[PDB]
Design an enzyme around this catalytic site. Structure first.
Site, mmCIF file in Angstrom:
data_model
loop_
_atom_site.group_PDB
_atom_site.id
_atom_site.type_symbol
_atom_site.label_atom_id
_atom_site.label_comp_id
_atom_site.label_asym_id
_atom_site.label_seq_id
_atom_site.Cartn_x
_atom_site.Cartn_y
_atom_site.Cartn_z
ATOM 1 N N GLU A 1 31.634 50.018 32.813
ATOM 2 C CA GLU A 1 32.115 48.744 33.354
ATOM 3 C C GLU A 1 31.781 48.578 34.838
ATOM 4 O O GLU A 1 30.747 48.006 35.195
ATOM 5 C CB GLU A 1 33.629 48.671 33.164
ATOM 6 N N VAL A 2 32.673 49.067 35.695
ATOM 7 C CA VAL A 2 32.480 48.996 37.140
ATOM 8 C C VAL A 2 32.090 50.377 37.672
ATOM 9 O O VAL A 2 32.738 51.374 37.364
ATOM 10 C CB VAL A 2 33.760 48.535 37.863
ATOM 11 N N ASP B 1 41.373 33.053 38.788
ATOM 12 C CA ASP B 1 41.805 34.388 38.416
ATOM 13 C C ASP B 1 42.560 35.095 39.539
ATOM 14 O O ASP B 1 42.606 36.314 39.593
ATOM 15 C CB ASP B 1 40.639 35.243 37.934
HETATM 16 Y Y LIG Z 1 39.648 39.278 35.486
#
Ligand SMILES: [Y+3]
Ligand SMILES: [Y+3]
Ligand SMILES: [Y+3]
Ligand SMILES: [Y+3]
Ligand SMILES: [Y+3]
Ligand SMILES: [Y+3]
Ligand SMILES: [Y+3]
Ligand SMILES: [Y+3]
Ligand SMILES: [Zn+2]
Ligand SMILES: [Zn+2]
EC number: 2.7.11.22
Lengths: 320, 38, 256, 48
Positions: free
Chosen positions: A25-26, A138
């Site tokens: 992912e990150v 967000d």
């Molecule tokens: Y998010």
């Protein structure tokens, strides 16, 4: 297949995994040649339906437009040679911490003066993104970044989009389900689809209160639970305070949550102390988005023009 | 006062560029109204 | 050069990927025009904005600066480009609907394979793939600026007639279809050429500004008259190379 | 072929589908019906 403009991710050496997301992912990384530390975000594609997620295309399109001090910076977009699948990666300037973690750690400390700068940076980012007709959508502690040098950055525009300055004609039908539950404005929880900037500003308020509470001030389990908490804090949602709120298809579902008195400043009193601070949190946590304060006027609120004025974040970042 | 006077017809010409674009699409005043919905 | 990345001189265009696999300069120009054609057609059928179409047309023109018409046929890329452009211009059409519209335009007689056939489900894959290839080849540079924007803005500032302003926007669209100007000049300049062109067709003369500056000096600083006449010339050259039909039905009848 | 306000946000734009179906006629008139008609009919360019 030439690809002169989409360098292969290899040029980056994965130094470590950021947070506990998915497998790849990150990732924190270093440019094999400049040593430059960058954050690698993979364009997750389980939304394998309609092709390259439009929601992704937006993030990217937006990231390349927003070039401001308080807005995370997108370096480039890399790929990984594909075969049986292909992946795309967003290369961001690496940022040391996130407001979520700093406030989580019982150790980090903030001076009213330091909070004031965190805030002034947040609102300045918002004002910029909003002045470029962009809604974050967000907002949440976890997405507010701070560099080693003490500079704030708004991150994760994966759910962001453009909006129209249409005081004019036809109402806009934007996506209703957006913003994490805990930072979602009332308008949205009631089904609103013609919202705008004010939704990020309600997050800005949930966040600002966090600087003193050290944890999400309204943690509902369900959307109705959320609304209940919001009512208990900001007061019952009624046409008295919210002109024409009746029309919301979902309002007729608040019937039993109708007697709360605005306890905003009272419940946060024990934590904030500073008057003007209690004031701006009060003006950001306004039920009717039309009466809710905006980024510009927040930036001119007395909280940003009264001792103690805003100071950098070296102190808070005190070696660690 | 406005920054620009209104466009004026200059049909007294020996302009190859205009002749050319004309021989291709036809007389403007004739076609002009077909272009588009409005 | 990042601002110059997708701009080429006459010579640079003189040698494209397609050329590399032996495709005549003119042959390529047609593949381009044809791609524009199918893009515009599919666009009106899907009923997306002309903004979307314009965008796809450029994605297509830039795309064929890297890839070759030999390896990627226009009739394959076009549907993918448009499908993308639609998402970028915030007027997204479902993959199915685009597939159907494309089938309809490319295979008029045949019928839409069952949404369960391998033939269908296969192209759903091919399209999604050509998509990611299109994205990677454009180096994810999705935001496009078109002459139309500057054309409208300018025609208004010069109190241009209604249809003159319309003819102007009409040329802006033809420049994306019939030429490669989007790979050689910035939008503002194209817009000037489009207007200059219309005024030539309609004998409209735009007087100098009450401040002395020419009309185009309010569109882009780099534009000059010499430039206008030169580019207008090339645009005519391109127009005169099409098998232009009008020249024959040009006068005889109307209809109902 | 039909000007649009640049100021309009993308999703606010109007469809490109002409207001009237495209005929099978090839006259000055029908040749300027819409973009597609102009390109194919007047100029004679086609993707098929
Ligand atoms: Y998010
Ligand atoms: Y009631
Ligand atoms: Y204001
Ligand atoms: Y007049
Ligand atoms: Y008329
Ligand atoms: Y008209
Ligand atoms: Y008319
Ligand atoms: Y030439
Ligand atoms: Zn006809
Ligand atoms: Zn037509």
């Amino acid at each position: 297949v030439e690809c002169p403009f989409c360098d292969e991710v290899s040029k980056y050496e994965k130094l470590a995994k950021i947070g506990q997301g998915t497998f790849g992912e990150v990732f924190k990384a270093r440019h094999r040649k400049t040593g430059q530390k960058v954050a690698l975000k993979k364009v997750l594609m389980e939304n394998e339906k309609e092709g390259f997620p439009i929601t992704a295309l937006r993030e990217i399109k937006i990231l390349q437009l927003l070039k401001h001090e308080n807005v995370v910076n997108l370096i480039e977009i890399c790929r990984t040679k594909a075969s049986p699948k292909g992946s795309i990666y967003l290369v961001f300037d690496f940022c040391e911490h996130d407001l979520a973690g700093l406030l989580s750690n019982v150790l980090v400390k903030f001076t009213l003066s330091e909070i004031k700068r965190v805030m002034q940076m947040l609102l300045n980012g918002l004002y910029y993104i909003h002045r470029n007709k962009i809604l974050h959508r967000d907002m949440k502690a976890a997405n507010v970044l701070i560099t080693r040098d003490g500079v704030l950055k708004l991150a994760d525009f994966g759910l962001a989009r453009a909006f129209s300055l249409a005081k004019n004609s036809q109402p806009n039908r934007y996506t209703n389900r957006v913003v994490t539950l805990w930072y979602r404005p009332p308008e949205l929880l009631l089904g609103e689809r013609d919202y705008g900037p004010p939704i990020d500003l309600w997050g800005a308020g949930c966040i600002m209160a966090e600087m003193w509470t050290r944890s999400p001030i309204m943690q509902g389990n369900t959307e109705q639970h959320q609304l209940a908490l919001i009512s208990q804090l900001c007061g019952s949602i009624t046409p008295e305070v919210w002109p024409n709120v009746d029309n919301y298809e979902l309002y007729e579902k608040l019937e039993l949550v109708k007697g709360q008195k605005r306890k905003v400043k009272d419940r946060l009193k024990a934590y904030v102390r500073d008057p003007y601070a209690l004031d701006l949190i009060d003006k950001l946590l306004v039920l009717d988005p039309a009466q809710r304060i905006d980024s510009d006027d927040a930036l001119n609120h007395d909280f940003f023009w009264s001792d103690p004025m805003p100071s950098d974040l070296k102190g808070m970042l005190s070696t660690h | 006062s406005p920054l620009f006077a209104e466009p004026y017809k200059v049909t007294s010409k020996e302009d190859k560029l205009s002749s050319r674009i004309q021989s291709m699409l036809g007389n403007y005043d004739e076609m002009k109204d077909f272009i588009g919905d409005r | 050069n990042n601002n110059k990345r997708w701009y080429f001189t006459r010579e640079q265009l003189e040698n494209s990927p397609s050329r590399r696999f032996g495709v005549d300069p003119d042959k390529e120009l047609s593949y381009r025009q044809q791609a524009a054609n199918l893009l515009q057609d599919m666009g009106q059928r899907l009923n997306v904005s002309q903004l979307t179409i314009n965008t796809a047309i450029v994605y297509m023109h830039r795309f064929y600066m890297i890839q070759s018409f030999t390896q990627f046929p226009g009739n394959s890329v076009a549907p993918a480009a448009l499908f993308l452009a639609a998402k970028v211009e915030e007027q997204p059409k479902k993959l199915e609907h685009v597939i159907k519209v494309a089938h309809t335009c490319l295979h008029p007689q045949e019928s839409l394979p069952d949404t369960r056939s391998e033939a269908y489900l296969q192209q759903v894959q091919d399209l999604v793939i050509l998509e990611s290839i299109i994205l990677q080849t454009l180096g994810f540079e999705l935001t496009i600026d078109h002459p139309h924007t500057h054309v409208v803005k300018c025609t208004q500032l010069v109190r241009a007639s209604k249809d003159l302003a319309q003819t102007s926007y009409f040329m802006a669209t033809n420049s994306l279809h019939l030429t490669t100007f989007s790979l050689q000049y910035t939008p503002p300049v194209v817009a000037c050429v489009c207007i200059h062109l219309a005024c030539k067709w309609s004998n409209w003369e735009i007087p100098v500004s009450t401040d002395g500056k020419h009309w185009w000096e309010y569109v882009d600083a780099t534009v000059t008259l010499e430039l206008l006449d030169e580019l207008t010339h090339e645009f005519l050259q391109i127009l005169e190379k099409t098998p232009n039909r009008l020249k024959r039905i040009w006068n005889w009848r109307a209809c109902e | 072929m039909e000007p649009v306000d640049p100021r309009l946000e993308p999703w606010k734009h109007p469809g490109s589908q002409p207001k009237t179906a495209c005929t099978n006629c090839y006259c000055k008139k029908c040749c300027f019906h819409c973009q597609v008609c102009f390109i194919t009919k007047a100029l004679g360019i086609s993707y098929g």
